Every structure is written in structure tokens, then in C-alpha cells.
Amino acid sequence: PSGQEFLVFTLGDEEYGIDILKVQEIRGYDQVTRIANTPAFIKGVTNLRGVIVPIVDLRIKFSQVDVDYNDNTVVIVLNLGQRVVGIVVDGVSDVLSLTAEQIRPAPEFAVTLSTEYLTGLGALGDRMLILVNIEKLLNSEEMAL
Amino acid sequence: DGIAFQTNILALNAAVEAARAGEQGRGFAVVAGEVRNLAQRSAQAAREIKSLIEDSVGKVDVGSTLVESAGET
Amino acid sequence: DGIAFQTNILALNAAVEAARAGEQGRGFAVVAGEVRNLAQRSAQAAREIKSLIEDSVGKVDVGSTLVESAGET
Amino acid sequence: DGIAFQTNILALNAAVEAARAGEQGRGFAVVAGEVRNLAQRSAQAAREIKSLIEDSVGKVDVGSTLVESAGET
Amino acid sequence: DGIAFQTNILALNAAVEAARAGEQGRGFAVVAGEVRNLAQRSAQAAREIKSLIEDSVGKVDVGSTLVESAGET
Amino acid sequence: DGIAFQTNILALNAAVEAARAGEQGRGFAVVAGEVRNLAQRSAQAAREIKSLIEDSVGKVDVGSTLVESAGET
Amino acid sequence: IRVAVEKVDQLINLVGELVITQSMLAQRSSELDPVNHGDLITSMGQLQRNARDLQESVMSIRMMPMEYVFSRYPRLVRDLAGKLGKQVELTLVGSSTELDKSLIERIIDPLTHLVRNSLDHGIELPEKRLAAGKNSVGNLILSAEHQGGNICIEVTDDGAGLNRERILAKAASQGLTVSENMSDDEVAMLIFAPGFSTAEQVTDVSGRGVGMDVVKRNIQKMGGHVEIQSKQGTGTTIRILLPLTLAILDGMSVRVADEVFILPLNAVMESLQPREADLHPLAGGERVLEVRGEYLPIVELWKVFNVAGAKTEATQGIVVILQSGGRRYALLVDQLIGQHQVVVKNLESNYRKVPGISAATILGDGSVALIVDVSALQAINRE
Amino acid sequence: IRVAVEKVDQLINLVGELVITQSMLAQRSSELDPVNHGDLITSMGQLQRNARDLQESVMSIRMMPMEYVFSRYPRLVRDLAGKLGKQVELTLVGSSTELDKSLIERIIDPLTHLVRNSLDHGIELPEKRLAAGKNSVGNLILSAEHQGGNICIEVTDDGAGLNRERILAKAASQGLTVSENMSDDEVAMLIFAPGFSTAEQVTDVSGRGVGMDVVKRNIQKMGGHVEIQSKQGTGTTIRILLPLTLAILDGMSVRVADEVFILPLNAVMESLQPREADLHPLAGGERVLEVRGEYLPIVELWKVFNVAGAKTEATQGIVVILQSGGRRYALLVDQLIGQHQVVVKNLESNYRKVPGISAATILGDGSVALIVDVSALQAINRE
């Protein structure tokens, strides 16, 4: 198959990647506007150049113990259809082209977690980056209740 | 060093914009490669200045004991 | 200062490619401007370092005169 | 200063030709705009040098008066 | 000197744009040639004024050398 | 300061009543706006008096120290 | 010249963005503070003056005859009257009047409901009318009139009107408040109440929905005003008044701590500073405020919306009186920022099941202010 | 939705006032000098960016099909061809192309004149065509295409084309310039000349007038470009290019003293700094400038418009080469401000007998700049 390009980033002292085409902007994390009684995944909203963007907690979703504005300093702004949303992360590394051959199965035993959500591990020089299906994850997790 | 870091992060964003532009982005991508190279080089030059500052301040620390000796002799 | 000037030349080349790429080059022009601003910031910072170095050198010459005066007392 | 003024006018003429070439003149237009900026900067640089020469000539007049006073001393 | 060198680089870009416009770039080539000629002339003038400053500063050093030599006699 | 705050809230209540009475509320709305201004002036003037009181009782501390000093001198 | 609807709606969105951009420029200009204040104020005032004239021209372009709405009514009225066993004649006044194309699309659903209410409940049977002593044929009047930068659209029948004693008896039977202390205006407000205007059949919510609450909400989402005037045996007059606007709502802006809330200005009765004497801790553990010898429940804004208050239990805030149908309650806030007209922004996916807030708006440099549903907030209080 | 034309023309007038108000704000902001330059430039750039999108949207709203113009041509062409003894068939390309309603109302008179020129002078008699060895039936092609922010409208025939030798012989007979030194471009420019394109019958001036000067002026008052490409025996192609804009003219802005003049950009050939050697005082008392070995009359701007100069007879200004038909002349000015696109303002009652200025525009804080008529200015010089 044709090569696939990923934006590579850090969360919980581990390395992850997502689809390049769905990424709009990469910006520094600054204080989020809170709304009461919201599901734990949603931090709140922020304003980017006049536009209100939802901000979501990737750290709680992946069961990571990192602290809000202390240990996470970057927001990656993602667009799916008419929905724009920022994922909170430690930082961004580089853009990486991966062939399908160098994508290894995810180690996780939970069925749709290790297939539909986790695409696999990208192997570069025996270093692994966790490839995440952000489109499936946002469409499923936010609408499950 | 912060400006050099900001330049590298801007270059990373610029590379994605060049990729989106496709055929039209090809020359801009080559320029972005040099921007990455200069961002690294600027940081290296700044580090060479830090090494000279450390050596110079080391001379001030050596000089301070000599100045105290000059005060006594 | 040379690296900042070279970075300004990279910004000029990016601006020429942005102009030739038209509508698809609209983002390239913003990057070329921002890179030029980062170069301007680097150059201005370098001039302030040069001024502080020149003042520091003058203090070193005065310190040399003071120890010479002490040496003759 | 006179050369800078010729360059400044040449940039205006170049811009009209670039405008006539339209979409295919856009890269040439960037060069004309930058040259127009440089010509204006060059005139200011010439004025500052002329001001420094005027101060220097005044200092020589003071220096001449001082050496005559040294002759009377 | 940096403005003259930058103008020379701009002349190369103009010459390339004239080449990239081919048979419709002949008027661009005339402008590129004039800017290139102006850059050569400004660079020569910059060397002459800098050399004249070096000779003039040399005369100040010769004059100060005479004054100290008179002082220590 | 309290009466000024009450005047400010009463002006806000008056603005709602003016909005309710529509074309008959237009003159009353101007009156409410000026009453809102008078509340701001009253509060501002009260704070300027607080600043004067804070200086004045500090002058009494200084005066008390000077009078005490006059006693022991 | 004839154009697509989407293009002229996009022009409205763009001139909305221009107004937002102008506010952003004003906020930056105020922070920057330019030296020549009169020159700045004159320049900004000229820009604002041009912007208002430009908006008026865009709205003037969007004008379309009321005839497009009115023309469809005589066939609908005659067949519907025949279905319900009535004899009715229809009078249409002001068909030549002008209003926005989006208003023309949005007005048909509530106007049709009002027309059905006149042909059903309002206008009696022809024998029944003859027995009363009036003409056997009913009179239904739909009138449209230009009013002060708004259009006023009036539905009037010669019916039996709204029986006030029956409404009061239903209110008394449910124990809503004392019938003697209900005004004619409060009785008119009760008509639009969510629990008092219920449809017989249960079905999923719609803009084409049944009931007076749906009518009130449809008018609110045109930024309009609506009122009901009625006399027993004379008939009912309902007036709908529509500005030239987007989804903009007239509100009262309030804070508790730094948290910003918007109270709809049609649901605000009055506002006041409460004294310690008039604050009554009546039995059940729910505080009461006395206003004019009337006992109203008093609710703290931070507590009911589940947000962090500023640590003050001392009596020094401002209390705003709100009405849900015929029932008044008092809502206590730290500060009032006053009356404002605010563009209404969707809550979208995150807030799917939130009940007390129907919308949001954006203030200053990106601050979020939450638009309260007054009857839902009363429902949260009794939860 | 369908709307009045005057309202959408008013929206154009108002957004023109917005651009003027933005320019006034920019001039005052530049004088004021806010401390945070990047924040100011960003804010002003965002306002400008919104203003361009808003203008583009307003222009997109004003779009109507070219079918409204084109659909009237086949009856007109067939009857007109019949009157002139021709056999001609009409091809219409790009009827579904889109352009402004005011362009539609202003293109018909020059387009009709071009169509008459093809059916009269361009396409020969059917026997004459058969004798030439080409189809007896003429081909007339009207084509419209969308080109880079403009619409390009092209009138092409399979006629006899324009006879260059005959045009040169007429120019030589009047003594306009040497025939050898006239380029094909200069010959094409000569077609639109006011004294070379004259009507047979004398009557009062009109927008519906006869002659190529009227055609060029009608296009100029839409802000458009127009060119003529022609080959002897093949036919003539005339292209009219109309931009997405108001009554705006592309100009070159110049000063003599502080007096501001605008030279139409299409009539500017080139501009240069004269040297003393190339300035020749030839007999008759009229100065000549040599450009590329060609002698051109040189005229001082302050003298010919009767204004006070800056007291300078020394050579140090800039000379602009202007062409009237096939004749070039050189116009000497103190300074160039450069190429500018300027809104065209009416002179009105005061200046109704003024011959060399056709319009004015307003610059900065109320400065007046005068729009030169190049052919009229040549006529003033020879008065």
C-alpha cells in the first residue's frame, strides 16, 4: 500500500502518533475555560483567534498520572468534519512517514482497543511509537454515553 | 536559545504546510530544511558563547583569589 | 549576525516561492514573515550583547588601571 | 546618496512591468518591493554618515583651536 | 556593504526570474542587469569609502603617535 | 461608598424599567445613565478621600513621633 | 436580480464577524490607549456609523413581502374551519409589508399554531355563536404592520377569549400561587408555561411542535417579543414582534465570583439589593425573600449551577426576580453587568444532557457566558 | 430571493465608504503610533482580511449569468446580417459564465458596436468570400471565460481582418509618424484614437455613441482592459476584460510641486530620468526628448495645467512617456508616487468646460488628485 504519514508526540513519558491530515495547528497549552458537571475527558474550551475550541484530556483517557499544566505543555488542534478539538499532550517530536510493513500489532489484549483504537506500533530503528486511530477514538468514546 | 527553539517549531509547522501544498510546496520544503539546519547552527553558536562565558567567569573566580592576594601582599 | 542575515535570505527565498505559488503560497508568506521577525529578534539581541560586551571590556580596562595604581602604592 | 535615489526610481519602474506581467510578475514584484525598501534604508544610512562627517569636521575645528592655544601656552 | 551584497543577491533572483519568464522576460533581464550593475558600483564605492576610512584612521594614529612622542621627550 | 453602590444598582434597575417602558422610557434612560455616572463619581471621590485619610493618619504617626522625640530631646 | 438564500445568510455571518472584529479592535484600542483621544473616538465612531448603515442596507436587501406567508392562509383556514365544524371568514391586512426571508421561513410554524387555536378553541360553533347573540360566521384577522425597526404581526379573533376563572381554578388546583394575587399580566405569562401548555400526546421535540412553550421558544430564536391580550366573549389578540436580527437575544448579564451568566430579559421581573430583615429562613430548609409583602424562594447562583463561589455568606449581593409561568422566584448573584443584546451560540456535542443552560455567548477576549433557561432552572431547584 | 438593483448598488457604495473609513483609521493610527506595533499590524491585517472576504462575498451575491446578454444576440445578428447583405452564423460560448448586474447593463452598447463592425466591415459578402476561397457563410463567435478575478469576453470573426497597410497609409497621409517605426501594438492603439475613429455624422456625445473612442471610454468606466488582435484574411479578435470592482481606474500617481495628478496606467508607456544630452531644443521653440533614437515632444506638467511650479528649470525630475493613438509624447513631473488603483469621482458643475481632466479622486485626509485625459492633454499642447 502507499506510505502513511503521522505526527509524532509524547504523553506519559511514552511516544505516540496520529494522522497528519486531521491536524490543524500545534499551540502551547494555556488556561482552559471550565463548565460544571462535564464528563472527565473534556477539560473545557478555549478561544483561538476568535474561534471556540473544545479541549480534551488525553492523559486521563490513557490512564496516565501526569499533572494538568505542570507536565503537559502542548495542545494539538484536530478537525473532524464540523468539530474542532484540541488534545492535551507533553510535546510534539516530528512528522514521520511509515510503511504498513513497519507497523507491528498493538500488544494490548482488549479486542477493539488493540485494533479499532490502537492501529499498532510504528517501528523505527527498534524504537516504537504507538499509532492511535484518533478518528475512531473521538467518534466512539465521546458518544458512548 | 528560545528564539532558535521557536524557529525549529515554526519549521515543523511549515513542513506540514509545504506537504499540504504538494507540487507548489516543493521549493518551500527545501528552504524549510535549511531553516531547520540554521536553527540547530544558531543554538550551537549560542552554546559556544556559553562555553566562552563559563571560561571567562572561571577567570573571574581565579582572579578573585588573586585580587584577595593583591590586597594582602 | 551572519546566521540572522542568512535566515533573512531564507525568508526572501520563501517569499519568492510564496509569490510564485499564489493562492497555495498564502501560508508560506506568513512563515516567511515570522522567520524574518525571528531573525530581526536575533539581530537586535546580538546588538545588545555587543553593547554589554563593550561596556564589560571598558570595566576590565578600568579594573586594570585600578590594580596598576594599587601596584604603584 | 545619488545612486540610492536612482535605485529608488528603478524600483518604481520595475513594479509597473511586474504588474503588467500579473500572476507571472509576482516573484519580480517581491524583488522590486525589497529593492524599494533597501533604497530608502540606503538614503538614511548616507544621512547618518553625513551627520557624523559634519560632527568630525567640527571636532577638527575645535582641535585646530586647541593646538593654536597649545602654541600660546 | 550588507545592503549592496543583499542587492546583488536580489539581482541574481531577478536574473533567474527573467530566465524563468523566457522570451517574455527580456524586459525583466534589462532591469536585472541594471540592478546587478548598481550592486557592482555600490560594492566598489563601499570598498573605496572603507579604505579611505582606514587611511583616515591611520592618519589619526600617525598624529596621536606624534603627540605621545613629543610628550615623552 | 455604600450609597454610591446603591445609586449604581438603582441605575441598573432603572435601565430595565426604561427598557420596559420603550418609547416613553427614552428620557428616563438618559437620567439613569447620568445617575450611573454620579454613582461612579461618588465612589471615586470617596476613594480619593480614603487616600487622603490614609496619608493624614500617617502624618499623625509622624507627628506623634516628632512630639515624642521633642519630649525626650 | 435573483440570488441563492445561502449567499445572503453568509453575508449576515460575515457582517457578524465584522462586528466581532470591530469589538476586538475596540478592546485592543482601549488597552493600547492612543494619545489623541478625540481623533480615536471620532475614527471609531465613524467606523461604527458606517457599520450600522451597512447592516441596515444588508437587512433592507433581505426584505421580502409578507404576502408569501399570508397568501397560503385562506385555503388552510377554510378547509381547517370545515374540519372543526366552524364558519369563519379571513381578513388579511398588510400583505404588502416587508420582512426578512429567514423570518418568513421561521414564522409559519407558530403562526399556523395560533390560527389553529382560533379555529379550534377561540371561535365557537355557528349555532353557539347565534345563541350568544353575535354573528354565526367567525372573524379571523391576520394583520402585519411596520413598527420602529421591527415588524408587528397580530392574530386577532372575534372568539370567546381565554376564560380567566378557569385558568385560575387550574392554577389553584395545582397550588401554583394564590388566585387573588395573580395579575392579568401574570395570567398571560402562565399561558406560555412548559407544564401548563402541554400537548395531549407524547412525542419527540420539534420546531414544528405542539404547545405555547414551542411558540414562545420559536419566537425567542428569532430574537422576538410575543404577548397575548384577551377579553372573555370578545376574542383573543396575539401580537408577535420581530426585530431585524440574527439569533440575538436581549439579556441581563450577571456574575457570581468571576463566572458569567446571562438571564433572558423577558423573564426578568425586577432586581434589587436584599436586606437581612426581609430574608426569612422558613421551614423545610429553603430560604425565602419578602418582596412587597410577597414570599418568594431565594436561590444562590453558584450553588445551583455547581460552580465555585467567592466565599461570601454575608448579605451584600444583588437578587434578580425571575418568573416561570405564574411562579416567581429570586436568584442571588454577586454583581450585575447590566442589559445586553447577545448573539446566541450553540452548546453542541459536549453538553448533550445539560438542562439549565440552553445556549452560550462569547464576551471580551474569549470569555464564555452561559444563557440560563429560567423554567429549567426552577425545575433544577425542585429536583 | 429577488431584490431591487438600487439596494445592491447602495451596498457597494457603503462598502466603498467602509474602505475609505478603514483608510482614515489607518492614517490616524499611523499618526498616533501605538506602542505594540505587532498587535496593531495583526489587528489591522485581520480587519483588512475580513474586508476583502466581505467584498468578495458582496460581489459573489451580485453575479448574474452572461446568458441575459448573449440570448439577445441571435435575432439581432441575423436581422443585421440580412440588412448588410451577409450570410453569417453565430456561435455563443460561455453563456453560463457569471458577472455583475451593472457590468451586464454597461457591456451591451460596446459589444453591439463590435458585433456591427464584424457584420459590416469584418465579414465580407458571400460571393466575395467564395471568390476568396473560404465559406460563403461568415462565422461570428462571442465567447466569455472566467480569468483570474476578471471575466474575459472575446468577439472573434472569420472576416477579412484590419488592413495594416491602409491604416499606415492614412497615418502617413496625415503625417502622424513614420510608417516603418509603427509597431503592430502601436497600430492597434491607433484604432482607439479619437481623431482616427470618428463617426460620419456629427451629433451630441452619448454612452450609446458611435466610434472606437466611445468603446474604449465605456470599458474604462467599468475599470476594464480592451485589446484588438487581427490578421489580414483570417479575421479580427477583440477581447474585453472586466474586473470584480467598482468605478476604479488603474493609474500612475505623480506630483509637480505639491500638485497631485493621475495618469491612466494603460496610456503610460514607460518612465525614466532624462539626462541633459538627450534633451534637444529643436526649432519652433518646442523641446524634444530622445528615447532610443526616437524624437518625442517633452511637456512640463505645471505649465500645461496652468499651476504654480516649484521654481526648478534644472534637469532632475522624472519624465513619463504617454501615447495618444499612434503618437507618443513625454510629460515631465517632479516626482512619482507610483501605481495606484483609484476610485473615480465626478468633477460636477464647477468644471463643466475643463478639457484636459476627465475626473478627480481623493487621497489621504482630503487631498485632491486630478485624472488626466491623455488625448485631450495632447490637444491642449497643440492649441
Author numbering:
A (entry chain C): 14 to 158
B (entry chain M), C (entry chain N), D (entry chain K), E (entry chain L), F (entry chain E): 369 to 441
G (entry chain A), H (entry chain B): 264 to 646
Could you pull the original sentences from the published paper?
Upon ligand occupancy changes, chemoreceptors transmit signals across the inner membrane that modulate the autophosphorylation activity of a homodimeric histidine kinase CheA, which is coupled to receptor control by an adaptor protein CheW. CheA regulation requires the assembly of core-signaling units (CSUs)4,13,14 with a well-defined structure, comprising two chemoreceptor trimer-of-dimers (TOD), a single CheA dimer and two CheW monomers. Upon formation of the CSU, CheA undergoes pronounced tertiary rearrangement, increasing its basal activity nearly three orders of magnitude. CSUs further cluster into large, hexagonally packed chemosensory arrays, which place each CheA under the influence of as many as 20 receptors, giving rise to highly cooperative signaling responses.
